[PDB]
Amino acid sequence: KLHLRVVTLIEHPFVFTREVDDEGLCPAGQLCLDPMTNDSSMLDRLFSSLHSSNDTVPIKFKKCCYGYCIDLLEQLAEDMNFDFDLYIVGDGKYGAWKNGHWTGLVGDLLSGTANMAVTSFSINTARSQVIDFTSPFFSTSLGILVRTRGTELSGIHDPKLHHPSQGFRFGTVRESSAEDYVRQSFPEMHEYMRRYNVPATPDGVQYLKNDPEKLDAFIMDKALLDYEVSIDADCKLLTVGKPFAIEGYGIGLPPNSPLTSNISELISQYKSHGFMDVLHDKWY
Amino acid sequence: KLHLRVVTLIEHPFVFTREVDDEGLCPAGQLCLDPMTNDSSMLDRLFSSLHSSNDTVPIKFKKCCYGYCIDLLEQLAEDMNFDFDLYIVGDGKYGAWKNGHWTGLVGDLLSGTANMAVTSFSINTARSQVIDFTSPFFSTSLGILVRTRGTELSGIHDPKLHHPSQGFRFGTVRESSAEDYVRQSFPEMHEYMRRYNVPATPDGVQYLKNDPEKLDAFIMDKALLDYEVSIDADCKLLTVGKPFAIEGYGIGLPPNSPLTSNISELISQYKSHGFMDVLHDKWYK
Ligand SMILES: [Cl-]
Ligand SMILES: [Cl-]
Ligand SMILES: [Cl-]
């Protein structure tokens, strides 16, 4: 039985977290750590302390993880007969090339801090040069979230984005695939957005949705924005414009991992036997 | 009962052609026309005649089409209750923006010459701004075909591909999504490749595989290159390098078409019930 350490990132409805229950258990999900570290030795020590008969892990690090990607991970673990430790990425980022290294999930796979990454993780060309991805389990365009009766946009080529009016505020999630697409296709746009980008999806959604309104538009994976629109109780939000920058979501592994092809085979069996449809129905 | 005109492009193993029999029939295939026109009125006239009690269509235009995308089209036609006329795109191209308009399949969708495009047609950002695509039925990286014991390449960032002084002979298919990727991401290498690009996949495979060798490497959808490697029994060819520019294949329709969502829902059901596995195994052998 193989023993993997899996890194994840909280992103609804793919991965959610909540506090652990009265007995320190997670009936509806998976026990995970949120330790704010990229140090493999620190993670070794914490998981060791978690599994032993004298668990001294700071309570604030213990969480229960659940969601579409957690259900997928549990099925994979059963079918491939591995067990796993699960932790949330310390910097909260998917990963970008910054200051001569990869951050986020990508950085943890390249440093050996994690054996596998499971979340709403986009397969793009830059990441594919340095880590392995499995076959995709989901596919999404990038999207543009605006308020109803607010900013109107045709898509990523709208002149309002390329020649912004004074006070026009739009941004994406820092160190995301979305930010890399803008950086590489529209460098001037990327520069303009820097002061408006946010650390994580919920922040952009809150900045656009709630008052006081801090963003006029928010660019991020459409699958994530559509989930937020679907739970909007007040006809306040919508996604606008033509599709752009479509990418799959895949599981991330170190380059040339022997596990990649076996996980890909199972993802293809799950797709072709309706399991992905069950997960979509459960979480969307 | 809807009646669509569908445009295709011959690309193995997604769409093949064979000749019509000596009676004008297509067992195990779909009768199609190869009329070399982008004029909607011409196609109207030829199909009219084809379906009349006095068929006078030039016989050299009649072909039988078959393959992965033809099996998919037949099934969609049954499930969405439409009839169709099928023809092969006149210019042989998927489509690019050239000289102020879209060419190939994209151009025929925008001009109304075709109602739907079915083949190994990549969903990319530029085309997505002007036509509709269904959800994808297949996904592929771009790939790099080389000879065994030939040129070695790490992927699309290999310095050999970015230094004209090294003189490597490498190209792609003209007016393909592969060419669009290089144009956008590597303008100087796009310029360099112009002398080596080819009209269609088989031309690049020939120049790479057969003697005298005219290409050192050929860049094109990896699904198509993998097919050519799979039918080369003699270990003459390899795909090399890291993945890049992954795209889905989808059915193309005019923008905002009411058919798109229904075809997408059927593609998603077919995928989730194993039909794409069946088609892949059948057509890749
Ligand atoms: Cl729980
Ligand atoms: Cl997918
Ligand atoms: Cl697909």
Curated annotation (Swiss-Prot), chain A:
Annotated positions binding D-serine: 122, 127, 177-178, 221
Binding site for glycine: 120, 122, 127, 177, 221
Species annotation: Rattus norvegicus
Tissues of expression: Isoform 1 and isoform 2 are expressed in olfactory bulb, frontal occipital, entorhinal and pyriform cortices, hippocampus, striatum, thalamus, cerebellum and spinal cord.
PTM field: N-glycosylated.
Residue positions with a glycan: 38, 54, 262
Protein name per the record: Glutamate receptor ionotropic, NMDA 3A
Subcellular location: Cell membrane; Postsynaptic cell membrane; Postsynaptic density
Disulfide-bonded cysteines: 26-64, 32-65
From Swiss-Prot, chain B:
Compartment list: Cell membrane; Postsynaptic cell membrane; Postsynaptic density
Residues reported to bind glycine: 120, 122, 127, 177, 221
Entry comment on modification after translation: N-glycosylated.
S-S pairs: 26-64, 32-65
Glycosylated position list: 38, 54, 262
Tissue and organ expression note: Isoform 1 and isoform 2 are expressed in olfactory bulb, frontal occipital, entorhinal and pyriform cortices, hippocampus, striatum, thalamus, cerebellum and spinal cord.
Ranges in the topological domain labelled Extracellular: 152-285
Binding of D-serine, residues: 122, 127, 177-178, 221
Role: Component of a non-conventional N-methyl-D-aspartate (NMDA) receptors (NMDARs) that function as heterotetrameric, ligand-gated cation channels with low calcium permeability and low voltage-dependent block by Mg(2+). During the development of neural circuits, participates in the synaptic refinement period, restricting spine maturation and growth. Forms glutamatergic receptor complexes with GluN1 and GluN2 subunits which are activated by glycine binding to the GluN1 and GluN3 subunits and L-glutamate binding to GluN2 subunits.
Assembly behavior: Heterotetramer. Forms heterotetrameric channels composed of two GluN1/zeta subunits (GRIN1), and two identical GluN3 subunits (GRIN3A or GRIN3B) (in vitro). Can also form heterotetrameric channels that contain at least two GluN1 subunits and at least a combination of one GluN2 and one GluN3 subunits (in vitro). Does not form functional homomeric channels. Found in a complex with GRIN1, GRIN2A or GRIN2B and PPP2CB. Probably interacts with PPP2CB. No complex with PPP2CB is detected when NMDARs are stimulated by NMDA.
Family statement drawn from the similarity comment of this UniProt entry: Belongs to the glutamate-gated ion channel (TC 1.A.10.1) family. NR3A/GRIN3A subfamily.
Protein name (record): Glutamate receptor ionotropic, NMDA 3A
Native organism: Rattus norvegicus (Rat)
Protein's gene: Grin3a
